[PDB]
């Protein structure tokens, strides 16, 4: 009966969960963790990553 309101709540929660999940994406870099990038590379290539 109350599918419309629950649907709106689901879309908002799902969008937030996807946005949080996207931090786990390398995006074509060696790692998804910034601290690792500093701890492992020189600034000329770390800047690129």
């Amino acid at each position: 009966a109350l599918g419309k309101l629950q649907d709106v709540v689901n879309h908002n929660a799902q969008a937030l969960n996807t946005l949080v999940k996207q931090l786990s994406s390398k995006f074509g870099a060696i790692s998804s963790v910034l601290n690792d990038i500093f701890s492992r590379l020189d600034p000329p290539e770390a800047e690129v990553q």
């Binding site: 963790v33 601290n35 690792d36 500093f38 701890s39």
Partner: peptide
Amino acid sequence: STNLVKNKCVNFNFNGLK
């Protein structure tokens, strides 16, 4: 290795993980 502190905001380095 340094000592561990509880309930305070610190910048830690555990085995290369910052």
